[PDB]
Design a protein around this ligand. Sequence first.
Ligand SMILES: Cc1ccccc1C
Length: 245
Amino acid sequence: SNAMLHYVHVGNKKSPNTLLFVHGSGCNLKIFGELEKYLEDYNCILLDLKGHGESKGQCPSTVYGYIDNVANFITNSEVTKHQKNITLIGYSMGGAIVLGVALKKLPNVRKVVSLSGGARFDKLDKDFMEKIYHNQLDNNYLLECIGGIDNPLSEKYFETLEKDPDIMINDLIACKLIDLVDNLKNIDIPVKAIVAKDELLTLVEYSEIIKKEVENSELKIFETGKHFLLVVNAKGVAEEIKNFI
Ligand SMILES: Cc1ccccc1C
């Protein structure tokens, strides 16, 4: 036995291109269920962060904790330690995490994608975050952020979110605390940000800052999709990963 994070391994396991997926606040690797369908030609590794999905333990309270956990996995897991061309794909809080991992300068991490993410989340809705600080999760606002559950894919994937609300609360507080912006200039590898213009949660402006600050960077703005862009337009998001890796 070992203390490695739980992961799922799918796709073309012999591909020279390894994609390591890192999920976001209050969810788990299940959130990538649609996106993984369009990336089958790659060696896909989907991680559960500590305390999420099948990875046991207390959820770290800071993005720095998650960054250290993910770096430990990359360096030490049998599934990544020998892989020479890793692209990190981080969604939501995972976007900040993969930017933080890029700053660790791991020899085998070659590119990063921040999907509906950011390096700082300073404009999170004040009333929503006040509730979070009072240990209350506004499901109406969460649904608004993902664009509702009328799309059957959205209904399905919304149900994959963690059932204990303490996890979402922990993760949103971690997001309100993180600020990697003034370190983005130190990232040596290519970074691509992908986001929907109609975001209420991970605003397009957060992705514009990533593009501005990282020297070798790309930005794709979809007109619509809100925070469930990776579910309702998984095919389009996958195309915008393929054109970058
Ligand atoms: C990752 C995730 C899932 C559902 C709502 C908000 C967020 C940040």
